[PDB]
Amino acid sequence: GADREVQRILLELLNQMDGFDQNVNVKVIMATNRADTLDPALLRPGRLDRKIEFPLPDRRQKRLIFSTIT
Amino acid sequence: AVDTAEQVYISSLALLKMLKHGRAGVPMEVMGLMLGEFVDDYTVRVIDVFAMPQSGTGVSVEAVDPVFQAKMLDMLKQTGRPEMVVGWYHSHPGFGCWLSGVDINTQQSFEALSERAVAVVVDPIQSVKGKVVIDAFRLINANMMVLGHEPRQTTSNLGHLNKPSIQALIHGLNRHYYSITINYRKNELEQKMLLNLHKKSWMEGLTLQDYSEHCKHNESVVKEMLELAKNYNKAVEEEDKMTPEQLAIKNVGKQDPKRHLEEHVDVLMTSNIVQCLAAMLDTVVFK
């Protein structure tokens, strides 16, 4: 059903990010849990390149997180 | 079978009844009959019009109740002034200057009853600020088309400002016979009464209003003209040496010299001096 509409919305967002073309110094970042389902149009280099994974609390870091929060 | 460049002397109160009835029954396409009399063939005059509630059936001849119409006519004869029924009016929000199929049918019944029974289209929704549409036409029999068509008679009057709508052209109405010219009974003792009394502002010109909202208004005025400062700045460095009109056409900015003209500055200047003169006039009155 409305999935085609979502695809068209992403297509326009791809159009806008291509229209950006480094004209100014603004930045765009998406946060996702799994990038497997994401469309290749954004996933391909030339539109967005830097892929960063933020893992689980990393027990040594987890104790650091608790100390910071506490 | 004679329909010259006919004109309707519609009355102002008939207009007011039309707009009030249309404003009341907006989406219902309320119906009514235009109370006019054929003093002669083409100088039809309408002095009064009434409002009737459309029945739940819709656009039907029985919706205009005959007994109710007769009682209303008797009431007008006893109190007021009697007037014949040779026309009808209808708020038409659906589309423009033409008649729907049912409207054509009920107008045909009216034409059978009356002599002409003009078909008047008044659009209550399109009339918003300046243009109210009152177009009147006649239904014709099949004989008028097979003879010399365009029943518009030999004169150069109904061709003045005769622009039937495109939906009216493709309907038979406003195309069967002609479009009737409209006139307004702007007689004196009536029109002078309206202009003198209704649009009443007679001692309201003494308002002072020095700084009721004007101190911050002047702040906005300075800010807006500061934008004009940047705009009139931007212009003086554009100012190219290649016939600046050539530069201006392809680089329109609607700046102070071009669109935000001196007239706006005059409006600001007039506003200031008016408050000045009013304050100063009452200051010398304060004795």
């Binding site: 149009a41 | 495109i166 939906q167 493709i170």
Partner: protein, 50 residues
């Protein structure tokens, strides 16, 4: 001129003016691309292949 834009009328929809292209700007980028430069001078190390 086919594959262009035009202006119509309200009811009869009669032509008013042949507008410039509107389909192309809107859906120019769906899954394709027009000609880039990327000249062969930038391509290097694969001379024996080109």
């Amino acid at each position: 001129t086919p594959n262009c834009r035009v202006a119509l009328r309200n009811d009869s929809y009669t032509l008013h003016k042949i507008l410039p292209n509107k389909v192309d700007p809107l859906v120019s980028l769906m899954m394709v691309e027009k000609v880039p430069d990327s000249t062969y001078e930038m391509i290097g190390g694969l001379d024996k292949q080109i």
